[PDB]
């Protein structure tokens, strides 16, 4: 039978409440196994189940470093989206990303994921072909355009097809 | 490993 891995990064900025809050949670099949919270005293990616404790310190290090970078990405794109939709500045908004991969019984990719939602509504998502994009409204139309131009689809596909699938396996053997 | 840093919106 098929298995899956899924990550959910969500950034939420609040009315004059400083920089947005960033969180990232990962799921293998349908169990949370890793998590990161910027609201933490010591922002770090940490194991949510015991079998993940069998990963080296180097693992948790770069995973955490990626998260810190991601925090900035959201911080910036939350702003570019304010523009796109012509909204205020002190306003309260949310921007989230969801990516992942399902694998078939043969352990090879079954479906790739990469998509974004702003303020609760769909924004843009990589289609099942990992080649084309679906753009919710007109603002998203702008992103789609540059992403089609820059070949974003191939960029994400690269990961979805191999790196992801490979790790989903690392984890599936771990427990 | 996570998905790489994403492109600009």
């Amino acid at each position: 039978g098929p298995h899956s891995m899924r990550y959910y990064e969500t950034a939420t900025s609040r009315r004059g409440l400083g920089e947005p809050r960033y969180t990232s949670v990962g799921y293998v099949d349908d169990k949370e196994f890793v998590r990161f919270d910027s609201d933490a005293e010591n922002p770090r990616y940490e194991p949510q189940v015991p079998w993940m404790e069998q990963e080296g310190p180097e693992y948790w290090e770069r995973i955490t470093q990626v998260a810190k970078g991601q925090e900035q990405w959201f911080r910036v794109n939350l702003r570019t989206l304010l523009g796109y939709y012509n909204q205020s500045a002190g306003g309260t908004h949310t921007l989230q990303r969801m990516y992942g991969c399902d694998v078939g019984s043969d352990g090879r990719l079954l479906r790739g994921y990469e998509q974004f939602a702003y303020d609760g509504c769909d924004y843009i998502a990589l289609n099942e072909d990992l080649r084309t994009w679906t753009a919710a409204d007109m603002a998203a139309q702008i992103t789609r355009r540059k992403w089609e131009q820059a070949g974003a689809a191939e960029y994400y596909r690269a990961y979805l097809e191999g790196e992801c699938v490979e790790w989903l396996h690392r984890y599936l053997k771990n427990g | 490993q996570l998905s790489p840093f994403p492109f600009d919106l």
Partner: T-cell receptor
Amino acid sequence: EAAVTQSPRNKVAVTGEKVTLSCNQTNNHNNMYWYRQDTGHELRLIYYSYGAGSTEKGDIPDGYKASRPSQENFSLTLESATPSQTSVYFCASGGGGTLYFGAGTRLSVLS
Amino acid sequence: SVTQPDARVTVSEGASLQLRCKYSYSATPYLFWYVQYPRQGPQLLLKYYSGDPVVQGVNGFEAEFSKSNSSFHLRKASVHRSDSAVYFCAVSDPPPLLTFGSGTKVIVL
């Protein structure tokens, strides 16, 4: 990219001088970088930025300070020029994936 | 980390050119090739993300990605004087950061 313009192209500084290299990009890119190449060889990252307000140290940030006041402006500052900093500085912008470089800024430090 | 084994390479105008590039990088490899003409910044030649392992670039340049051989060698079937320059192989180390190779100087006769 003709969108990335550095200033100046040639600069000579005296030891101790506070030097500020300026970069401008009309690519509407969030990421901007400052590399240095000094043997026609490998370019090495000094500082980069995820977007306005972001300032991240590279592999050799010592003696350098950076500033991302806005979207299209990223400036590298040598607080106190030292001959170890004479090199060719390149600025780049990118919206994920491909990086686009400026013409370069040749900076020499006379003692 | 990316490695360009040859510091200098010389070819007879009209001949084929091949610049080797090996990469050691655990994560998803995002490889590129930049050319740097005298007194100028690096310019993108070609890049490889996924799909066709053989990518095409500007100026009759192409490269082939080989997960097995861990290479991303560059090639041009017929070089001209114009191609004399320094060629860089680069891998997106942690994206969005880019790590350059030591470069290779190409001299055409």
